[PDB]
Nucleic acid binder design. Structure first.
Ligand SMILES: C[C@H](CCC(=O)NCCC[N+](C)(C)C[C@H](O)CS(=O)(=O)O)[C@H]1CC[C@H]2[C@@H]3[C@H](O)C[C@@H]4C[C@H](O)CC[C@]4(C)[C@H]3C[C@H](O)[C@]12C
Ligand SMILES: Nc1ccn([C@@H]2O[C@H](COP(=O)(O)OP(=O)(O)OP(=O)(O)O)[C@@H](O)[C@H]2O)c(=O)n1
Ligand SMILES: [Mg+2]
Ligand SMILES: [Mg+2]
Ligand SMILES: [Mg+2]
Ligand SMILES: [Mg+2]
Ligand SMILES: [Zn+2]
Ligand SMILES: [Zn+2]
Lengths: 334, 1367, 96, 48
DNA sequence: GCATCCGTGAGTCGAGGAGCACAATTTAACACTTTTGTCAAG
DNA sequence: CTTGACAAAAGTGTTAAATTGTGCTATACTGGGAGCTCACGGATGC
């Protein structure tokens, strides 16, 4: 007891008796009359219909509270003909709560058929509950159709969307998830028909126009779930995928060393240059501020025009070529 | 700015948000197409930082010039990419969630403060029962509701929403009640249904409306899709609607004026409510709550008379108040967090202090446990409500990476899945709350949100573990990451993988010196690569380092000068050779590498025993110390030639071994001939004449005139050893022939081999006189004699000459064993002639036992015992016959010589080869009646081989299943004594222990001298506390007992001059956080006073645990590890002995009914009701003392402690642990056991708080309370009366001051939970805490005693002094 | 592993051996300079190839991982100094 | 129980096919197995 | 007494891994300037 | 070192085409389903 969350939830929803068809119509009528009453209230009292439905909902549920009482007392200040519409609004909200509560068995029966698709059983039910709430808002009892007929569309819609949105660590858009599901179904039908695993050409041909072997391969590559870093290898519980994946982001001690070796050798080579000529290359190549500068931007720092700096920058570049050729102390770092 | 202490504490929701660089609002990780991390997700660059250094997401800023800047286009700060390892996020929970650590860690920390049990806390937290936070005048079953009361869902619904019930009527029948009529419990509503509650019964759905027109009982049928719009008994005018409908065609109206009556309800709703009709518009509406006196509907004319939710029925024109209370009851962490917010810890402490005076012990214990948690929160400054999470921290993404791999597919950690679920449920709950979802939907989501947090923090702690869909593997949570053998502590902090490390197979190098190893060139090139690249750059091999490295990448590109440079690199440097398991400290030794051709490591033969390394496929690890400190430590402290003695016992550990002993024993043993053997003569010339005639052999013992000599002693008299060995070379005499030699002016009568051995030692030590005193010439050199020579050479000469002597012994032992001619043949396993006679004697006696049993003179169990005793006796007789035959007839037999010299084998194994295999045991432990009468030379039968396989399997299983127990024991011992270091020269204590020289012998009932190994293991290398006068020799106070002093003390005990020796021991040491130099004694590996700063605690644990693990891998199965672990854990034995709590005279009252023992004193008389099967070791007429055993068995350490005292239990624990290791022949000094026992007796329990803030029964360290007592005494206050306490190594290690060391050991969840609440600050005193932080350990070269030493030449010192004192 | 060109595991018992020997600096190098001190191991390699002695090591990265994982458990782990003042072991890279 | 075939030499593969394992799905555990499960029984004569 | 949690040696070589319609949004392709480097002499 | 041409790469806009996110669908359907030589002593809890 209380250690199985599914069992505890089922017991909780089992405490609300199922609605007879008469009770369903009465509750459905009250919600529609209540929603219309909120519209009539807003039109007359002038505030936002969304604002009023929250105030009415707050009073029913009970327990910004500063303004809720201000609006609630304002609504009660209306005359009798207008306080009546408040009464239907309150009963409509109370009936909406009761109508949602009594259909919590419907979501469970629908949600039990969607297990094993990346979401847990309780996650499916809660997503089904969101669809059930949407069903009550849009349900119309004037058409004389029972609630389970129309709710089932919204309950399955919410479960499908949640799976397409929450069943993968790397989220894939709904349209592509539908494509991936359609691709897998098409492959399986060919696989059971041809008695072997179909090739990409065969899968693409069965899919239809606009599909080739390249697109099928890309879609399958996209549909590759990431693998856990903690999955063990072998019977011994001491090795995981994380123990065999090197880190290629941080520089290795060798890479950091040769970068320092290059930096100290380049500044030593630049010493042979003139005071200004070395400054131009270090600033044109971004060795001082970190970022490469332009001839115009370098020009403002020395007050020199664009064309002249290119000449001294090239002349300084040529002198380093002369020095490197006579020493060969810089070729190896390339 | 040096980390000196680490503090752990609770994190407030405010502090968690201060850590976070941004809230993670979406579960998205990365985009599926571009692979760039998604905004507001788990990998958002705006929160955790840029993927690459100095570059925003939009790619507008890409250099370090804009450092410390946040781009306006994307919001990503331009900084280093490594900040993604350090920048955290947070999840703003829609509703608070409790931290599972402070809930499910027994005893619950939240439950302790709130006085809620584990059951009650779980029910509230996981939304099973409500808890009252404001009763609001609620009455439940006639009893007012109080705060902190637990309500079930049914009870809360009745109180909050009232009592109501619907009864579905059968179709067609009409109820006998009317709409709006009160009923009572049990009253019939319809003729088929009855009520269960008293209240207003109202019509739900009238299936038929019967209007009475005034002109007329016209009947209307009401379908489910139609509703009645008028009351019952309502006057409806012609035209007014009666029943509404969706389609107006079927809508029913009123033809004329009439009264509407409702009939045939679908069901009757009986609600316990009050009805109030209203004349004008109602001042309240549906869903509001009213109290007695509130103006209900008619502008003050109609007023409420009872609490309840008000619902107005527009059609009935009445106002219904459903009797209910606005009770404030909530579930989950919301109510729990509010309860912890309202707690006044100061007020709670005062109440707990008052309750702490209850004479009941149980209530004081419960109050103390609660008060410890309350005091922890007050002193730490944490707040109790911080244990409920309002914002959940998010780990930095680089610690939970989603990395692409060598291929193209992605790999992610399990924390991303746990974070995603928490975000998915948190966002869904926010949506559900915004849609005004019903309570059941909200309650289910809040419960799921709580479980999502619990799974993230500690997966599987509560409920079923969370598994990744598509697999059954539990997800790895934060608790799993930091706890266990594979956790962060043990896998990445206490041990790490290291660079500059290699591994290869080891082979024997006999030509190596003791300090040298054979390192392959290819390993050395890679291990010393950075040093090599510099050397190639120094020479002309390569222009620079980078060109040098490219040269070494390709094997065919390496020239011959690289190897020459590699020789220059390793000159002087040493490497560390390592063999797993590193049971003791000499499992890692420093060697000077010698580059060799090949791929295997050459290991010196003498270091094999220390490493436990043979050459049947062993492998070793190579490590390269880098800096000058690391090289200096390895060359000075860790060098193989410097560690010659065993730290556990002080005996030599690098000593001659199997092949070396055999070669030295073979040449030093003499020949014993039997040809002459007894003839007597008159002159030596006659004896010599007989030898030339063949009547008497060269070594036959004869008598010349009166003296017993041999012909060799007379015929061959050599002037000097050079002539004696010259005769050996020419073949006149052998090394084993006893002759007469003149050596050092003495006309010795020994063999040339013994004289040769004397020169071997003399030339090795380069001093003839000392080497003469070190050797034992008149005996063959076995393992024991060679071990004594190494120890004596170490004392007289030092490490350098002993290592030289060790190498000389190794060279000559190997040389002589090769040419001597040791070989094993099938005939070398000589079958004694006595075996056949013994077996026939056994068979005749076995038949006699069988004949006696057939006559019924003895039972089955007795006959089986008699059979075993006969076969055990016969087996022992054959063992003697096997070795007697060797000693008399084949003194040079390879099996005999190997066994006698100690090179290989024991008499038990020689018997199986030469005598008989013996008795074997069934898998149940019973022995087979028939023994294995055939040896290995004769060959077992198929049945005997199968019978013998039961014990081989049983022994092999123990070799595998007892290693974990010993290795676990060693880890316990290390973690409890890791902080013990020699920290000062002398603590100034006047206490000591009196090591007994005589032990009570129970079978004789008298004092007998203990064994020499017993006294040496308890007195060697110990400082005398008091002056001792023995045999005219004065051993003054403070004198370290050497091995000669121990022998002198033993000799004095034999003369009845001393019964016990007072020595300074760690047990009586007063040094805080360790021991002192004068209380520890010698460093047994150097036979000199222990150096200040040595980690003797680690040495003690390794010294104790090594024989336990070493022997089980080769006894310890029954009374080894089981008894040692039981003793070290201070566990109560199952068959515990019975001790007398008081001293007095015993009075046995044995009777047929029961056995009772009475201990009688002057006024006291204690009664001990022993079981019938009790082996009493005391009889009537004896004076027993307190704690003295009365029954054979194992003494409970805790009972002995409270009956005799701390000194007695310390003596008992050290002695009993020693008794085990002595049984298997292990020599281990008492210091190491006393160090561990000192840690066990480290804590005390408060009995009288006195003038202090401590609580009665509180457990704290003895050093702290003694310091507290003297402080209280200094300021004139009542001292704290405490009680000595004993706890095992596991409990003592877990209750240490440092949480870092305790968390890394065990109970990481429990240790961290208690530390965070208490706000414990770790001062980083021991060794593990410094290892975790990577600091310099406060032992060895890292100790404050030696770390600040300064070295300077005189010229600079004179210059500094002259240039400063000149002013 | 040899296949991954990996290092040798210097486990707990090997650490105990250095502690028993008193090789405080040899132990510290293996814990920091040769395993996970990123700044230390880069500077140590650079120092060696320049013919210099390796610098003094720093805090290991595994301890930084431990602190951040402890912080993910809502535990305020703070490294202090002699005067109980907080010490930043993250070089200012995690201070908002 | 589906193990990588040990085929160093023909005897290796022959042994691997005749090995009997108490572990695997539905069997004992390497660490939770006592001395009784691992000891040679009197009925292994001629069978194991 | 029992219910539950916690513990059970160290290295190593391989082996391993439902549909469509709609609005909303971002990603590409096309032009037209911009700035930005290259000769051109003087 | 300047001035003036010259490509032109880089930068700013435009509509378009994928690409992604979102709401809807009306017979009636109203409490899951998976797993089963439990490993065994020891310590702290009601
Ligand atoms: C006493 C004698 C010299 C006397 C003199 O100089 N006059 C010295 C000089 C060279 C020494 C030998 C070599 O070291 C090799 C070898 C080393 C082993 O460790 C022990 C055995 C060996 C044979 C040694 C024995 C002895 O020690 C010798 C003969
Ligand atoms: N599961 C194991 C098996 C072996 N070892 C180590 O490897 C050695 C293997 O020893 P073994 O070959 O079984 O016997 P020896 O002691 O070598 O036998 P002998 O004395 O006859 O040479 C053990 O002692 C131990 O050092 C281990 O640590 N863990
Ligand atoms: Mg295996
Ligand atoms: Mg061996
Ligand atoms: Mg071996
Ligand atoms: Mg002679
Ligand atoms: Zn940017
Ligand atoms: Zn002391």
């Amino acid at each position: 007891s209380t250690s199985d969350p599914v069992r505890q939830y089922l017991h909780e929803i089992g405490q609300v008796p199922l609605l007879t068809l008469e009770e369903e119509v009465e509750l459905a009528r009250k919600v529609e009359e209540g929603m219309e009453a909120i519209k009539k209230l807003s039109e007359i009292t002038g505030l936002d219909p969304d604002l009023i439905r929250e105030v009415v909902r707050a009073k029913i549920l009970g327990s910004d509270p500063k303004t809720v009482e201000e609006i609630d007392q304002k609504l009660k200040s209306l005359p009798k003909e207008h306080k009546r519409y408040l009464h239907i609004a309150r009963e409509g909200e109370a009936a909406r709560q009761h109508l949602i509560e009594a259909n919590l068995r419907l979501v469970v029966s629908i949600a039990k058929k969607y297990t094993g698709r990346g979401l847990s059983f309780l996650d499916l039910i809660q997503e089904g509950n969101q669809g059930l709430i949407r069903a009550v808002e849009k349900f119309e009892y004037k058409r004389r159709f029972k609630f389970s007929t129309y709710a089932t569309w919204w309950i399955r819609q919410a479960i499908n969307r949640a799976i397409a949105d929450q069943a993968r660590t790397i989220r894939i858009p709904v349209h592509m998830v539908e494509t991936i599901n359609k691709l897998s179904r098409t492959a399986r039908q060919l696989q059971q028909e041809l008695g072997r695993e179909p090739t990409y050409e065969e899968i693409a041909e069965a899919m239809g126009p606009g599909w080739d072997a390249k697109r099928v391969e890309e879609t399958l590559k996209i549909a590759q779930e990431p693998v856990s870093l903690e999955t063990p290898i072998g019977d011994e519980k001491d090795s995981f995928y994380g123990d065999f994946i090197p880190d290629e982001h941080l520089p290795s001690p060798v890479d950091a060393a040769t970068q320092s070796l290059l930096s100290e050798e380049l500044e030593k080579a630049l010493s042979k240059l003139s005071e200004r000529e070395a400054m131009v290359l270090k600033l044109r190549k971004g060795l001082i501020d970190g970022r490469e500068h332009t001839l115009e931007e370098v020009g403002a720092f020395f007050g020199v025009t664009r064309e002249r700096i290119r000449q001294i920058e090239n002349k300084a570049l040529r002198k380093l070529k002369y020095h490197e050729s006579r020493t060969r102390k810089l070729r190896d770092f390339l | 700015k040096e980390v000196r202490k680490v503090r752990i504490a609770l994190a407030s929701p405010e502090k968690i948000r201060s850590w976070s660089y941004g809230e993670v609002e979406k579960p998205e990780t990365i985009n599926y197409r571009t692979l760039k991390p998604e905004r507001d997700g788990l990998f958002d660059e705006r929160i955790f930082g840029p993927i690459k250094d100095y570059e925003c997401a939009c790619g507008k800023y890409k250099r370090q010039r804009f450092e410390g800047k946040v781009c306006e286009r994307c919001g990503v700060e331009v900084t280093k990419s490594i900040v993604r390892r350090y920048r955290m996020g947070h999840i703003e929970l829609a509703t608070p969630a409790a931290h599972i650590w402070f809930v499910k860690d027994v005893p619950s920390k939240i439950g302790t403060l709130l006085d809620l049990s584990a059951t009650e806390l779980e029910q509230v937290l996981y939304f099973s029962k409500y808890i009252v936070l404001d009763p609001k005048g609620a009455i439940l079953n006639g009893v007012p509701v109080e705060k902190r009361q637990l309500l079930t869902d049914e009870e809360y619904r009745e109180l909050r929403y009232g009592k109501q019930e619907t009864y579905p009527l059968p179709p067609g029948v009409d109820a006998l009640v009317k709409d709006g009529e009160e009923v009572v419990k049990g009253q019939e509503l319809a003729p088929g249904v009855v009520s269960r509650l008293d209240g207003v019964a109202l019509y739900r759905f009238p299936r038929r409306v019967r209007v009475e027109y005034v002109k007329e009982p016209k009947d209307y049928r009401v379908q489910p899709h139609m509703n009645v719009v008028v009351p019952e008994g309502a006057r409806v005018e012609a035209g007014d609607k009666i029943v509404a409908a969706i389609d107006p065609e079927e809508e029913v109206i009123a033809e004329a004026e009439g009264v509407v009556h409702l009939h045939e309800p679908a069901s009757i709703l009986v609600v316990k409510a009050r009805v109030y009709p209203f004349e004008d518009d109602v001042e309240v509406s549906t869903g509001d709550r009213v109290a007695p006196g509130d103006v209900l509907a008619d502008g003050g004319k109609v007023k409420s008379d009872v609490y309840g939710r008000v619902e107005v029925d527009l059609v009935r024109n009445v106002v219904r108040v459903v009797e209910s209370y606005d009770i404030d009851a909530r579930m989950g962490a919301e109510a729990i967090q509010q309860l912890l917010k309202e707690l006044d810890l100061e007020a709670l402490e005062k109440e707990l202090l008052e309750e702490m005076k209850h004479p009941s012990r149980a209530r004081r214990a419960k109050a103390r446990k609660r008060l410890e948690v309350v005091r922890a929160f007050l002193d730490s400054g944490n707040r109790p409500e911080w244990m409920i999470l309002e914002a959940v921290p998010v780990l930095p993404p680089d610690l939970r990476p989603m990395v692409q791999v060598d291929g193209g597919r992605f790999a992610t950690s399990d924390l991303n899945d746990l974070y995603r679920r928490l975000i998915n449920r948190n966002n869904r709950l926010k949506k559900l709350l915004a849609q005004g979802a019903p309570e059941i939907i909200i309650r289910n989501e809040k419960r799921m949100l709580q479980e999502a947090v619990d799974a993230l923090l500690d997966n599987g702690r509560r409920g079923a573990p969370v598994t990744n869909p598509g697999s059954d593997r539990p997800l790895r949570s934060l608790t799993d990451i930091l706890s266990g053998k594979q956790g962060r502590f043990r896998q990445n902090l206490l041990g790490k993988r290291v660079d500059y490390s290699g591994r290869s197979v080891i082979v024997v190098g006999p030509q190596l010196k003791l300090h040298q190893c054979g390192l392959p060139k290819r390993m050395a090139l890679e291990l010393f690569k950075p040093f090599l690249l510099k050397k190639m750059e120094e020479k002309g091999i390569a222009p620079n380092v980078k060109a040098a490295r490219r040269m070494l990448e390709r094997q065919r590109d390496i020239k011959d000068e690289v190897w020459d440079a590699l020789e220059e690199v390793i000159h002087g440097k040493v490497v560390l050779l390592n063999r797993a398991p590193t049971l003791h400290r000499l499992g890692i030794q420093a060697f000077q590498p010698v580059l060799v051709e090949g791929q295997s490591i050459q290991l010196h033969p003498l270091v094999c025993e220390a490493f436990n390394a043979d050459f049947d496929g062993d492998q070793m690890a190579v490590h390269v110390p880098l800096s000058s400190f690391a090289q200096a430590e390895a060359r000075i402290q860790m060098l193989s030639a410097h560690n010659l003695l065993s730290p556990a016992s002080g005996e030599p550990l690098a000593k001659p071994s199997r092949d070396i002993i055999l070669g030295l024993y073979y040449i030093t043993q003499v020949r014993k001939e039997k040809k002459g053997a007894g003839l007597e003569f008159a002159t030596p010339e006659e004896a010599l004449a007989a030898h030339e005639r063949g009547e008497v052999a060269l070594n036959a013992p004869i008598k010349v005139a009166g003296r017993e000599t041999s012909v060799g002693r007379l015929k061959y008299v050599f002037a000097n050893p050079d002539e004696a060995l010259l005769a050996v070379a020419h073949g006149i005499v052998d090394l084993q022939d006893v002759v007469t030699v003149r050596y050092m002016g003495k006309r010795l009568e020994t063999s040339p081999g013994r004289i040769l051995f004397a020169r071997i030692v003399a030339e090795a030590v380069e001093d003839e006189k000392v080497a003469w005193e070190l050797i034992q010439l008149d005996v063959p050199q076995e393992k024991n004699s060679l071990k004594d020579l190494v120890y004596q050479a170490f004392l007289r000469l030092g490490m350098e000459k002993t290592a030289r002597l060790l190498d000389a012994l190794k060279y000559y032992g190997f040389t002589f064993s090769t040419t001597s001619g040791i070989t094993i043949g099938i005939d070398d396993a000589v079958i004694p002639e006595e075996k056949k006679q013994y077996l026939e004697e056994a068979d005749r006696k076995l038949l006699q036992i069988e004949q006696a049993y057939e006559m019924g003179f003895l039972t089955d169990r007795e006959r089986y015992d008699q059979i075993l005793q006969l076969w055990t006796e016969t087996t022992e007789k054959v063992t003697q016959a096997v070795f007697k035959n060797f000693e008399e007839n084949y003194p040079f037999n390879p099996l005999y010589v190997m066994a006698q010299s100690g090179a290989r084998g024991n008499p038990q194994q020689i018997r199986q080869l030469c005598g008989l295999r013996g008795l074997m045991q069934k898998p149940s432990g019973e022995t087979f009646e028939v023994p294995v009468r055939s040896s290995f030379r004769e060959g077992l039968t198929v049945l005997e081989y199968f019978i013998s396989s039961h014990g081989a399997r049983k022994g092999g299983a123990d070799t595998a299943l007892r290693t974990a127990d010993s290795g676990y024991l060693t880890r316990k011992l290390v973690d409890v004594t890791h902080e013990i270091v020699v920290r000062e020269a002398d603590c100034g204590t006047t206490n000591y222990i009196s090591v007994p020289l005589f032990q009570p012998d129970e079978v004789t009932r008298s004092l007998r001298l203990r064994k020499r190994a017993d006294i040496e293991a308890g007195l060697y290398g110990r400082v005398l506390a008091r002056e001792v006068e023995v045999l005219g020799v004065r051993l003054e106070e403070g004198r370290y007992l050497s091995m000669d002093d121990v022998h002198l003390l033993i000799k004095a005990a034999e003369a009845g001059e001393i019964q016990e020796v007072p020595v300074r021991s760690p047990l009586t040491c007063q040094t805080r956080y360790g021991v002192c130099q004068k209380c520890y004694g010698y460093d047994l590996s150097m036979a000199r006073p222990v150096s200040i700063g040595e980690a003797v605690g680690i040495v003690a644990a390794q010294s104790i645990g090594e024989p336990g693990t070493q022997l089980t891998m080769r006894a310890d199965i029954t009374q080894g590890l089981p008894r040692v672990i039981e003793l070290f854990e201070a566990r109560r034995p199952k068959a515990k002995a019975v001790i007398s709590e008081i001293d007095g005279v015993v009075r046995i009252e044995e009777t047929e009914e029961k056995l009772s023992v009475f201990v009688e004193s002057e006024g006291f008389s204690k009664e001990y009701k022993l079981p019938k099967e009790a082996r009493l070791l005391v009889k009537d007429g004896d004076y027993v003392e307190a704690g003295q055993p009365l029954t054979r068995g194992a003494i409970d350490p805790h009972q002995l402690l409270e009956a005799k005292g701390p000194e007695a239990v310390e003596r008992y624990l050290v002695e009993e642990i020693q008794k085990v290791y002595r049984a298997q022949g292990v020599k281990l000094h008492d210091k190491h056991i006393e160090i561990v026992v000192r840690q066990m007796m480290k804590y005390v329990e408060v009995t009288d708080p006195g003038d202090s803030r401590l609580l009665e029964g509180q457990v704290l360290e003895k050093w702290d309370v003694e310091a507290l007592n003297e402080r209280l005494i200094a300021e004139g206050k009542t001292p704290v009366a405490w009680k000595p306490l004993l706890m095992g190594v596991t409990k003592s290690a877990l209750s240490t001051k440092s949480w870092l060391s305790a968390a890394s050991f065990q109970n990481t969840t429990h240790v961290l939970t208690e530390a965070a609440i208490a706000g414990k600050k770790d001062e980083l005193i021991g060794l593990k805490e410094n290892v975790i932080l990577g600091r310099l350990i406060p032992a060895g070269t890292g100790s404050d005693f030696v770390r600040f030493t300064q070295v300077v030449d005189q010229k600079t010192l004179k210059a500094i002094e002259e240039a400063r004192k000149e002013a | 592993g040899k296949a991954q060109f990996g290092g040798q595991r210097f486990g707990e018992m090997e650490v105990w051996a250095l502690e028993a020997y008193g090789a405080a600096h040899t132990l510290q190098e293996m814990l920091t300079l040769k395993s996970d001190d990123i700044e230390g191991r880069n500077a140590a390699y650079e120092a060696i190839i320049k013919g210099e002695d390796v610098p003094e090591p720093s805090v290991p990265e595994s301890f930084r991982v431990l602190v951040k994982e402890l912080q993910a458990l809502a535990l305020d782990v703070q490294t202090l100094d002699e005067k109980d003042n907080p010490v930043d072991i993250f070089e200012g890279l995690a201070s908002k | 129980l589906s193990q990588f075939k040990d085929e160093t030499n023909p005897l290796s593969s022959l042994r691997h096919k005749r090995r009997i394992s108490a572990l695997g799905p539905g069997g004992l555990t390497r660490e939770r197995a006592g001395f009784d499960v691992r000891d040679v029984h009197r009925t292994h004569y001629g069978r194991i």
